[PDB]
């Protein structure tokens, strides 16, 4: 119904061999969603959904080496689970299962069948889809045709917060289970509810091909930067129950010219420490054939200061973050693009700051269309 997170997006790790990356946590994919509010639960329609990103290469063909390290589209699997929450669904056995939808990659079982009137001009699109499209169509299509495939989950509402969570259901809820806050605030604020759950959705960016005929294999790895654009380490979580990484790589989509990854991802600095940081998003075009990988550089980088000028961290919803174009070492160093503004409402007060003032003031020609955007919810 609202179409946004009401909790932070639990990273599960799964391998290629069909036992997951964290081969320990297969017994302890554990993961209770909390500051689950009253009016949480009175949603007419909630959702489990579970955002299923390929890692590796960009494209599965055998003879070559493809890059590594690369995010693409892969499905999402959704069930309604408004009855579970509403306290009407709840019980320990029931492994309710959500099935799963894969992009549409159908295009190889009826094309043996077509004959006497050939005339097509058309491509394959089965991986240039954003996970948000997916979820959109689970969302509307409750039974999926998923053959099979999806994750079986044992769903249960628990009374409470974090602490009537642990002191009545210890054995369902362990201290090893992941622990997901609530994208936005729970309706008893205790006094002393110290956060920084600052909260980076990779909306989406555009960026120009240029020469290329092949549209840019995107990946925004964003990164968090003080006022000298060190790498924040740790700063930024892919979610709950994970590690935070320090530059989170975006979903390296299949040659898309408008990529959207939607990806809401915790970034959790130090509330003091957020007071002298931001966060620079960096653009790498992920071509299919490795060594262009690691010979493609950084084409665009963007970035956004987590603190306004105006003595205040960065506002909540969202910012489009504008992709700059130019010398690479000029946008690497802070004290050049930090200066330079970021988002498209700081690069319209500086220029029209400069209009007044026509002092050695040539609006920079760096402003390309090229644009990314993030949705932001400081739970602090």
Known sequence: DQSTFISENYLIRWGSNGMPKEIEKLNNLQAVFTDLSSMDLIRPRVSLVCQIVRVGHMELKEGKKHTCGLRRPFGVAVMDITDIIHGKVDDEEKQHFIPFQQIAMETYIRQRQLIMS??????????????????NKVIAAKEVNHKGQG??????????????????????????????????????????????????????????????????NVEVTMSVHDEE??????????????????????????????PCWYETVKVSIAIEEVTRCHIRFTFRHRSSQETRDKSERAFGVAFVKLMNPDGTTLQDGRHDLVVYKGDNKKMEDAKFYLTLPGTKMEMEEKELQASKNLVTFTPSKDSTKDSFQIATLICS
């Open 118 to 135: 050939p005339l097509i001009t058309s491509h394959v699109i089965g991986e240039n889809e954003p996970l948000t499209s997916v979820l």
């Open 151 to 216: 994750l079986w989950v044992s769903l249960k509402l628990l009374p409470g917060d974090l602490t009537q969570v642990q002191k009545n259901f210890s054995h369902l809820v362990d201290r090893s289970t992941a622990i997901a806050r609530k994208m936005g605030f729970p309706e008893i604020i205790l006094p002393g509810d110290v956060r920084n759950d600052i909260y980076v959705t990779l909306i989406h960016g555009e960026f120009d091909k240029g020469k290329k005929k092949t549209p840019k």
């Open 229 to 258: 654009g060190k790498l924040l380490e740790k700063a930024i979580h892919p979610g709950a129950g994970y590690e935070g990484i320090s530059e989170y790589k975006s979903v390296v989509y299949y040659q898309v010219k408008q």
